[PDB]
DNA sequence: AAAAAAAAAAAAAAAA
DNA sequence: TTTTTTTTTTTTTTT
DNA sequence: CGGTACCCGGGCATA
DNA sequence: TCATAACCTATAGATATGCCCGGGTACCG
RNA sequence: UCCGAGCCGGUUGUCGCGCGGUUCAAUCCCUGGUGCGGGUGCUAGUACCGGCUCCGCACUAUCUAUAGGUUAUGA
């Protein structure tokens, strides 16, 4: 089940109007914000200075003892055996690492709550990175050592005289993964680039499962891959490939949210004795600083208010708390056809990019909520400009720009990227400190939820108070292509859940080549028409655009004697989303999807 | 009269 | 789903 | 000049 | 190929209670 | 490196149409939404409904950090 929810609002209506809780919460954010950061590099800089000699045995504890070492230095005197090895261990590091960035010890008290909090995110972020990332760049890795893009330049393409070479890509990468034994004769059959690809993979002496392939093992134990997922970033750089971030880094200047929960009230905030807080409700203690009247803190779905918070100076996330927290093809039409029947209104959606959302009924109406508006609506592109011009105005663009990469793994130039990160900390760190920088996070956020709202809002007068809605299962998440911009495509099947409207996915092949008006694709045509490109700096360069959104069906059924064009034209969306009713159409009255948008 | 140059349409490719 | 690049052909001009 | 006792507070472990 | 911001998409986590000890205050021979 | 949405046409359910005309919407400040009432003014029509703004109450909205692809900027 879910056990939890969040309501974003403001700091300023968060918290009650007092100055000296106000400041608290500040500072106190501000310590954390630098611990959290040094904290990683922290991490990182330990497990380059011992590449030396062996690859450490990364654990939560260890992220902790960086934490109180960087705060505490020497003055952390842990009780259990298992982290006070540790304390020994990354002492000569961790002092090591202050002096080269210059990192003062804050000697910041009532530590543990952050420090776990930190603690537990940092080491979650390692499981999250090596969980997928790892299978990812490991394949990549074998495409690039072999350079298959240029292979298919270099051999002939769709022909049977070169599908050898992805079948025995396939073979290889089988081996490489240990997904299938290798055969004792298959090591003579190697060619010198393939010999020398076998040892550089051998050499990261990666974990292995006997029962189930090595995808379902990265699950099992992601953690076991670390080292491996490190020497793999050793490989990218040796040879020039695009580096990936192998260990993460919390390299934001930016002030970032920090949990505050009861225990950091007393503490910080309101700085009364653990003695005296323990004697009062945790409500009447939350009270006295922030506003539980406000409408952020009221109680949803059997969820209420549990004293947890992150802000960061601008705005404020309450967290909602159930009380049973554990306290330490489906969603295709095809089978969801009975709820359709029933529905008041059946709304199909074809989503695109510059059209993030065309939408159409039976009825005949169309409604699309364009790239260009929300871009408009939720301000990140106007933001865009102003960002870049604080940076103008600062002159900080020529100091980020030069920084070296912290993607690298060699210790000498990453001491190099401490230093140069050093040189202009303290510029850097007014400018990030303009209130503008986090307000634009929370604009965005209230600018994201107004156009998200609006949507519905101008759906619902559209095609009804409520409705079904029926969208195509193309989606690039993750996975933008290059070029072009990034696009809601699943988070809308989220945000429809969110406001109770039933959202169901439908197979979209052929759609984009069936004209409605004949349910044939014997005579659609594409990308005739040409123009000078849209995009300025394109269209600067003299390169010519061909109209990707018109398409026309040349059937003389289809055609009227007295058009001269010869073509019965059509809107790409508009003929995926009239292509959409005819398949529910079908599949309503019963008679399935149809023939001619069947891939068989 | 023969050899060479500008432009249109088709296609691959993206990536694990 | 959308762009970019290349290639092949196709059409035309120059000498 | 040294040695007990009560008690609070900081700090750390852990499910 | 590299640096900053972001938009989207995916993962994991979403606090609280008890006990050690050592030093302050008080006193006696 | 540039961009709002709807409508009448050139059009025929047509183009990121740097095609024309036309209606209202947003630039800073703001957590958003639905229903149930009470209380300020601001615009028609033949002494009275609707939209815009606050009050309070029922529930509705999951975010933070990291990483991958891409984008704008600076090399
Ligand atoms: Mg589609
Ligand atoms: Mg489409
Ligand atoms: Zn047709």
Same mark, same amino acid.
């Given at each position: 089940?879910?056990?939890?929810?969040?309501?974003?609002? !403001?700091?300023?209506?968060?918290?009650?109007?007092?100055?000296?809780?106000?400041?608290?919460? =500040?500072?106190?954010?501000?310590?954390?914000?630098? +611990?959290?950061?040094?904290?990683?590099?922290?991490?990182?800089?330990?497990?380059?200075?011992?590449?030396?000699?062996?690859?450490?045995?990364?654990?939560?504890?260890?992220?902790?003892?960086?934490?109180? =070492? +960087?705060?505490?230095?020497?003055?952390?005197?842990?009780?259990?055996?298992?982290?006070?090895?540790?304390?020994?261990?990354?002492?000569?590091?961790?002092?090591?690492?202050?002096?080269?960035?210059? *990192?003062?010890?804050?000697?910041?008290?009532?530590?543990?709550?952050?420090?776990?909090?930190?603690?537990?995110?940092?080491?979650?972020?390692?499981?999250?990175?090596?969980?997928?990332?790892?299978?990812?760049?490991?394949?990549?890795?074998?495409?690039?050592?072999?350079?298959?893009?240029?292979?298919?330049?270099?051999?002939?393409?769709?022909?049977?005289?070169?599908?050898?070479?992805?079948?025995?890509?396939?073979?290889?990468?089988?081996?490489?993964?240990?997904?299938?034994?290798?055969?004792?004769? *298959?090591?003579?059959?190697?060619?010198?680039?393939?010999?020398?690809?076998?040892?550089?993979?051998?050499? =990261?002496?990666?974990?292995? =499962?006997?029962?189930?392939?090595?995808?379902?093992?990265?699950?099992?134990?992601? &953690?076991?891959?670390?080292?491996?997922?490190?020497?793999? !970033?050793?490989?990218?750089?040796?040879?020039?490939?695009?580096?990936?971030?192998?260990?993460? +880094?919390?390299?934001?200047?930016?002030?970032?949210?920090?949990?505050?929960?009861?225990?950091?009230?007393?503490?910080? %905030?309101?700085?009364?004795?653990?003695?005296?807080?323990?004697?009062?409700?945790?409500?009447?203690?939350? &009270?006295?600083?922030?506003? +539980?009247?406000?409408?952020? *803190?009221?109680?949803?779905?059997?969820?209420?208010?549990?004293?947890?918070?992150?802000?960061?100076?601008?705005?404020?996330?309450?967290?909602?708390?159930?009380?049973?927290?554990?306290?330490?093809?489906?969603?295709?039409?095809?089978?969801?056809?009975?709820?359709?029947?029933?529905?008041?209104?059946?709304?199909?959606?074809?989503?695109?990019?510059?059209?993030?959302?065309?939408?159409?009924?039976?009825?005949?109406?169309?409604?699309?909520?364009?790239?260009?508006?929300?871009?408009?609506?939720?301000?990140?592109?106007?933001?865009?400009?102003?960002?870049?011009?604080?940076?103008?105005?600062?002159?900080?663009?020529? %100091?980020?720009?030069? %920084?070296?990469?912290?993607?690298?793994?060699?210790?000498?130039?990453?001491?190099?990227?401490?230093?140069?990160?050093?040189?202009?900390?303290?510029?850097?760190?007014?400018?990030?400190?303009?209130?503008?920088?986090?307000?634009?996070?929370?604009?965005?956020?209230?600018?994201?939820?107004?156009?998200?709202?609006?949507?519905?809002?101008? &759906?619902?007068?559209?095609?009804?108070?409520? *409705?079904?809605?029926?969208?195509?299962?193309?989606?690039?998440?993750?996975?933008?292509?290059?070029?072009?911009?990034?696009?809601?495509?699943?988070?809308?099947?989220?945000?429809?859940?969110?406001?109770?409207?039933?959202?169901?996915?439908?197979?979209?092949?052929?759609?984009? !080549?069936?004209?409605?008006?004949?349910?044939?694709?014997?005579?659609?045509?594409?990308?005739?028409?040409?123009?000078?490109?849209?995009?300025?700096?394109?269209?600067?360069?003299?390169?010519?655009?061909?109209?990707?959104?018109?398409?026309?069906?040349?059937?003389?059924?289809?055609?009227?004697?007295?058009?001269?064009?010869?073509?019965?034209?059509?809107?790409?969306?508009?003929?995926?989303?009239?292509? &959409?009713?005819?398949?529910?159409?079908?599949?309503?009255?019963?008679?399935?999807?149809?023939?001619?948008?069947?891939?068989?």
């Amino acid at each position: 089940p879910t056990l939890h929810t969040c309501n974003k609002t !403001s700091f300023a209506k968060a918290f009650l109007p007092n100055e000296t809780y106000r400041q608290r919460l =500040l500072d106190y954010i501000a310590i954390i914000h630098q +611990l959290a950061d040094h904290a990683s590099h922290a991490l990182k800089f330990y497990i380059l200075s011992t590449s030396t000699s062996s690859f450490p045995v990364v654990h939560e504890d260890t992220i902790e003892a960086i934490l109180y =070492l +960087l705060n505490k230095g020497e003055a952390w005197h842990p009780r259990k055996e298992a982290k006070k090895a540790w304390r020994d261990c990354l002492l000569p590091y961790v002092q090591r690492y202050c002096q080269i960035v210059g *990192f003062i010890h804050p000697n910041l008290r009532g530590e543990q709550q952050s420090i776990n909090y930190l603690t537990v995110s940092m080491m979650t972020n390692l499981k999250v990175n090596v969980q997928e990332h790892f299978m990812q760049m490991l394949l990549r890795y074998i495409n690039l050592r072999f350079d298959v893009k240029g292979q298919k330049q270099r051999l002939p393409p769709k022909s049977d005289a070169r599908k050898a070479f992805f079948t025995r890509l396939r073979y290889l990468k089988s081996v490489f993964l240990f997904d299938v034994v290798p055969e004792l004769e *298959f090591l003579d059959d190697l060619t010198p680039l393939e010999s020398e690809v076998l040892e550089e993979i051998w050499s =990261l002496d990666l974990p292995f =499962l006997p029962n189930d392939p090595l995808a379902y093992a990265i699950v099992a134990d992601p &953690m076991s891959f670390f080292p491996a997922y490190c020497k793999l !970033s050793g490989l990218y750089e040796q040879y020039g490939f695009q580096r990936f971030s192998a260990i993460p +880094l919390r390299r934001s200047l930016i002030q970032s949210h920090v949990r505050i929960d009861t225990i950091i009230l007393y503490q910080h %905030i309101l700085c009364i004795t653990r003695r005296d807080a323990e004697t009062v409700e945790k409500d009447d203690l939350w &009270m006295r600083v922030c506003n +539980l009247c406000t409408k952020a *803190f009221r109680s949803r779905c059997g969820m209420h208010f549990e004293g947890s918070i992150t802000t960061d100076g601008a705005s404020v996330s309450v967290y909602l708390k159930h009380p049973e927290a554990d306290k330490y093809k489906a969603l295709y039409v095809e089978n969801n056809l009975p709820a359709c029947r029933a529905a008041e209104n059946v709304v199909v959606i074809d989503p695109n990019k510059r059209d993030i959302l065309y939408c159409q009924d039976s009825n005949g109406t169309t409604f699309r909520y364009t790239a260009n508006q929300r871009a408009v609506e939720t301000g990140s592109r106007r933001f865009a400009k102003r960002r870049e011009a604080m940076k103008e105005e600062a002159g900080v663009d020529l %100091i980020e720009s030069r %920084i070296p990469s912290h993607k690298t793994m060699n210790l000498m130039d990453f001491t190099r990227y401490l230093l140069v990160r050093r040189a202009d900390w303290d510029r850097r760190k007014e400018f990030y400190s303009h209130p503008a920088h986090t307000r634009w996070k929370w604009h965005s956020f209230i600018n994201r939820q107004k156009s998200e709202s609006d949507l519905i809002s101008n &759906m619902r007068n559209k095609y009804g108070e409520n *409705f079904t809605v029926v969208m195509g299962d193309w989606s690039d998440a993750g996975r933008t292509a290059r070029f072009q911009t990034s696009s809601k495509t699943k988070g809308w099947r989220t945000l429809f859940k969110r406001n109770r409207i039933d959202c169901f996915l439908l197979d979209e092949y052929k759609t984009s !080549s069936v004209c409605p008006r004949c349910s044939s694709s014997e005579f659609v045509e594409k990308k005739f028409k040409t123009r000078p490109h849209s995009r300025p700096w394109r269209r600067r360069e003299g390169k010519i655009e061909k109209v990707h959104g018109l398409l026309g069906c040349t059937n003389p059924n289809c055609l009227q004697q007295a058009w001269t064009s010869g073509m019965r034209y059509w809107n790409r969306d508009m003929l995926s989303t009239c292509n &959409m009713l005819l398949i529910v159409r079908s599949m309503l009255d019963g008679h399935g999807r149809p023939e001619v948008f069947s891939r068989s």
